[PDB]
Amino acid sequence: GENLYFQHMRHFARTHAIGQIVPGKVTKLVPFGAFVRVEEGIEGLVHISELAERHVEVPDQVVAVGDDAMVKVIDIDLERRRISLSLKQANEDYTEEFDPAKYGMADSYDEQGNYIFPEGFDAETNEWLEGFEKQRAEWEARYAEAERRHKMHTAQMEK
Protein backbone atom coordinates (compact mmCIF):
# COMPACT_ATOMS: atom_id res chain seq x y z
CA GLY A 1 0.00 0.00 0.00
CA GLU A 2 1.78 3.15 -1.18
CA ASN A 3 2.42 5.36 2.03
CA LEU A 4 5.29 4.34 4.26
CA TYR A 5 5.38 4.53 8.10
CA PHE A 6 8.49 4.01 10.16
CA GLN A 7 6.24 2.31 12.69
CA HIS A 8 5.02 -0.29 10.11
CA MET A 9 8.50 -1.02 8.65
CA ARG A 10 9.69 -1.39 12.21
CA HIS A 11 6.88 -3.83 12.99
CA PHE A 12 7.82 -5.80 9.82
CA ALA A 13 11.52 -6.02 10.85
CA ARG A 14 10.60 -7.27 14.33
CA THR A 15 8.23 -9.94 13.05
CA HIS A 16 10.33 -11.10 10.07
CA ALA A 17 13.67 -12.74 10.26
CA ILE A 18 16.42 -12.11 7.87
CA GLY A 19 16.39 -15.15 5.57
CA GLN A 20 12.60 -15.50 5.70
CA ILE A 21 10.94 -16.29 2.39
CA VAL A 22 7.77 -14.30 1.77
CA PRO A 23 5.10 -13.86 -0.95
CA GLY A 24 5.51 -10.71 -3.02
CA LYS A 25 4.07 -9.04 -6.06
CA VAL A 26 6.26 -7.60 -8.78
CA THR A 27 5.10 -4.00 -9.12
CA LYS A 28 7.68 -2.27 -11.27
CA LEU A 29 10.65 -3.02 -13.53
CA VAL A 30 13.73 -0.82 -13.84
CA PRO A 31 17.09 -1.48 -15.55
CA PHE A 32 18.89 -2.57 -12.32
CA GLY A 33 16.09 -4.74 -10.88
CA ALA A 34 12.48 -5.40 -9.97
CA PHE A 35 10.43 -3.79 -7.17
CA VAL A 36 8.45 -6.34 -5.20
CA ARG A 37 5.70 -5.53 -2.72
CA VAL A 38 5.70 -7.96 0.15
CA GLU A 39 3.08 -6.26 2.40
CA GLU A 40 1.14 -3.06 2.81
CA GLY A 41 3.78 -0.36 2.91
CA ILE A 42 6.60 -2.85 2.42
CA GLU A 43 8.10 -2.83 -1.02
CA GLY A 44 11.66 -4.00 -1.75
CA LEU A 45 14.06 -4.04 -4.66
CA VAL A 46 15.25 -7.40 -5.96
CA HIS A 47 18.49 -6.36 -7.61
CA ILE A 48 18.99 -7.63 -11.18
CA SER A 49 21.85 -9.85 -9.98
CA GLU A 50 19.39 -11.41 -7.47
CA LEU A 51 16.72 -12.54 -9.88
CA ALA A 52 18.02 -15.93 -11.19
CA GLU A 53 21.00 -18.19 -11.46
CA ARG A 54 21.50 -17.58 -15.25
CA HIS A 55 22.99 -14.32 -16.47
CA VAL A 56 20.29 -11.69 -16.88
CA GLU A 57 20.54 -8.48 -18.93
CA VAL A 58 17.13 -7.08 -18.23
CA PRO A 59 14.71 -8.01 -15.47
CA ASP A 60 11.97 -8.67 -18.03
CA GLN A 61 13.72 -11.91 -18.84
CA VAL A 62 12.78 -13.37 -15.48
CA VAL A 63 9.69 -11.58 -14.19
CA ALA A 64 6.93 -9.22 -15.30
CA VAL A 65 4.79 -6.58 -13.54
CA GLY A 66 2.05 -8.61 -11.91
CA ASP A 67 4.01 -11.81 -11.24
CA ASP A 68 3.74 -13.32 -7.76
CA ALA A 69 7.05 -14.53 -6.40
CA MET A 70 8.46 -16.07 -3.26
CA VAL A 71 11.42 -13.91 -2.32
CA LYS A 72 13.97 -13.98 0.50
CA VAL A 73 14.41 -11.01 2.86
CA ILE A 74 18.13 -10.35 2.77
CA ASP A 75 18.34 -7.04 4.63
CA ILE A 76 16.24 -4.34 6.19
CA ASP A 77 17.37 -0.74 6.53
CA LEU A 78 14.97 1.07 8.86
CA GLU A 79 16.75 4.34 8.50
CA ARG A 80 16.56 4.58 4.86
CA ARG A 81 13.29 2.63 4.77
CA ARG A 82 14.63 0.10 2.32
CA ILE A 83 14.13 -3.65 2.25
CA SER A 84 16.43 -5.88 0.11
CA LEU A 85 15.04 -9.02 -1.40
CA SER A 86 16.34 -11.89 -3.52
CA LEU A 87 14.48 -14.33 -5.79
CA LYS A 88 17.64 -16.25 -6.63
CA GLN A 89 18.49 -16.83 -2.97
CA ALA A 90 15.01 -17.91 -2.06
CA ASN A 91 15.44 -20.57 -4.78
CA GLU A 92 18.92 -21.57 -3.58
CA ASP A 93 17.53 -22.09 -0.04
CA TYR A 94 14.53 -24.11 -1.25
CA THR A 95 14.21 -27.65 -0.08
CA GLU A 96 11.44 -30.19 -0.68
CA GLU A 97 11.53 -30.84 3.02
CA PHE A 98 9.49 -28.12 4.76
CA ASP A 99 11.44 -25.86 7.19
CA PRO A 100 8.82 -23.79 8.97
CA ALA A 101 11.46 -21.38 10.19
CA LYS A 102 11.94 -20.13 6.64
CA TYR A 103 8.26 -19.45 6.10
CA GLY A 104 6.95 -17.66 9.20
CA MET A 105 7.62 -19.92 12.19
CA ALA A 106 11.07 -18.55 12.99
CA ASP A 107 10.15 -17.77 16.54
CA SER A 108 9.26 -21.41 17.22
CA TYR A 109 13.04 -22.05 17.29
CA ASP A 110 15.30 -20.85 20.03
CA GLU A 111 18.72 -19.33 19.51
CA GLN A 112 20.34 -22.74 19.36
CA GLY A 113 17.71 -23.84 16.78
CA ASN A 114 15.66 -26.15 19.05
CA TYR A 115 11.94 -26.35 18.49
CA ILE A 116 9.97 -24.46 21.09
CA PHE A 117 6.61 -26.13 21.81
CA PRO A 118 3.72 -23.63 21.51
CA GLU A 119 1.83 -22.29 24.54
CA GLY A 120 -0.94 -24.75 25.40
CA PHE A 121 0.67 -27.84 23.80
CA ASP A 122 2.16 -30.29 26.25
CA ALA A 123 5.39 -31.81 24.94
CA GLU A 124 5.44 -34.92 27.26
CA THR A 125 1.94 -36.12 26.47
CA ASN A 126 2.10 -34.55 23.03
CA GLU A 127 -1.40 -33.09 23.22
CA TRP A 128 -3.15 -29.70 23.27
CA LEU A 129 -4.42 -28.81 26.81
CA GLU A 130 -8.05 -28.23 27.57
CA GLY A 131 -8.67 -24.48 27.73
CA PHE A 132 -6.04 -23.67 25.11
CA GLU A 133 -8.47 -24.12 22.17
CA LYS A 134 -8.09 -20.57 20.97
CA GLN A 135 -4.23 -20.76 21.10
CA ARG A 136 -4.40 -24.09 19.22
CA ALA A 137 -6.49 -22.45 16.47
CA GLU A 138 -4.05 -19.45 16.23
CA TRP A 139 -1.07 -21.81 16.01
CA GLU A 140 -2.76 -23.99 13.42
CA ALA A 141 -3.62 -20.89 11.31
CA ARG A 142 0.06 -19.93 11.48
CA TYR A 143 1.45 -23.29 10.51
CA ALA A 144 -1.12 -23.39 7.78
CA GLU A 145 -0.03 -20.11 6.32
CA ALA A 146 3.65 -21.10 6.59
CA GLU A 147 2.92 -24.41 4.81
CA ARG A 148 0.88 -22.69 2.07
CA ARG A 149 3.90 -20.38 1.43
CA HIS A 150 6.25 -23.31 1.08
CA LYS A 151 3.72 -24.98 -1.29
CA MET A 152 3.69 -21.71 -3.31
CA HIS A 153 7.49 -21.93 -3.37
CA THR A 154 7.41 -25.58 -4.58
CA ALA A 155 5.07 -24.30 -7.39
CA GLN A 156 7.63 -21.56 -8.16
CA MET A 157 10.47 -24.10 -8.40
CA GLU A 158 8.29 -26.33 -10.60
CA LYS A 159 8.21 -23.43 -13.21
DSSP letter assigned to residue 19: T
Resolution in A: 2.3
Measured distance CA(32)–CA(155) in Å, rounded:
26
Residue from 17, 74, 16, 21 nearest 46 by CA: 74
Cβ neighbors of 109 (< 8 A, separation 6 or more) are: 101, 115, 116
46, burial (CB in 10 Å: exposed 0-12, middle 13-18, buried 19+) = buried
23-33 burial code (b ≥16 CB/10 A, e <16):
bbebeebeeeb
132 three-state secondary structure:
coil
Measured distance CA(20)–CA(44) in Å, rounded:
14
DSSP letter assigned to residue 115: B
Cβ neighbors of 31 (< 8 A, separation 6 or more) are: 48, 58, 59
Residue 156 falls in which region: left (phi positive, over 0), alpha (psi -120 to 50) or beta: alpha
